[PDB]
Amino acid sequence: CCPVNWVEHERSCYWFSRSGKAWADADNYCRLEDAHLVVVTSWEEQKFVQHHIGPVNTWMGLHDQNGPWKWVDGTDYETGFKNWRPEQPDDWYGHGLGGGEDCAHFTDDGRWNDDVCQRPYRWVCETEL
Ligand SMILES: Nc1nc2c(ncn2[C@@H]2O[C@H](CO)[C@@H](O)[C@H]2O)c(=O)[nH]1
Ligand SMILES: [Ca+2]
Ligand SMILES: [Ca+2]
Ligand SMILES: [Ca+2]
Ligand SMILES: [Ca+2]
């Protein structure tokens, strides 16, 4: 029951961009497809997403723009799956672009990093069947 060009996996439909957008734009894009930026809640889901994105920085539906870490669909961050890269998240200001780092993305090895929301990265949308 996924739309055409979406990939079905464990009761979810995924769409993998082949272009980049700033996090807020990627967020708006997913919402307009009645979907959200991918919410990763298991090791199995992480591996599935990694397979399709490859070694490329890719936005996910996890951010801390208004304070504590939140998943875009309300999934609790504290008791949920996490796959941060060691020493991440670090809310780095050293990039000199203003602010810390408020948006999460999969890195080239799949592990997560918090980065500057304005960066154009590829993204993944997810909808639940
Ligand atoms: N402290 C520090 N972290 C860095 C530096 N360059 C990159 N990073 C980190 O590496 C991430 C990119 O993979 C950034 O979001 C930061 O967390 C640097 O010069 N200093
Ligand atoms: Ca999910
Ligand atoms: Ca932050
Ligand atoms: Ca970081
Ligand atoms: Ca950039």
Was 44 annotated as part of a binding site? no
Interval between CA 79 and ligand 4 midpoint (Å)? 21
Token reading at 11: 């009761």
Which ligand sits closest to the CA of 22? 5
Distance of alpha carbon 97 from alpha carbon 55, whole angstroms:
25
**Residue type at position 62:** L
Contacts of 105 (CB under 8 A, 6+ apart): 57, 58, 59, 60, 112, 113, 115, 121
- The number of folded domains in the chain is 1
Distance of alpha carbon 71 from alpha carbon 60, whole angstroms:
9
Interval between CA 72 and ligand 4 midpoint (Å)? 19
Token reading at 91: 């809310």
What ligand 1 atom has the least distance to the C-alpha of 101? 15
| Prior bond of 55 cis (ω within 30°) | no
Distance of alpha carbon 40 from alpha carbon 55, whole angstroms:
17
Which resolution, in Å, applies to this structure?
1.4
For 51, the 3-state DSSP assignment is: helix
Domain containing 50 equals 1-129
For 96, the 3-state DSSP assignment is: coil
Q: End-to-end alpha-carbon separation of the chain, Å?
A: 7
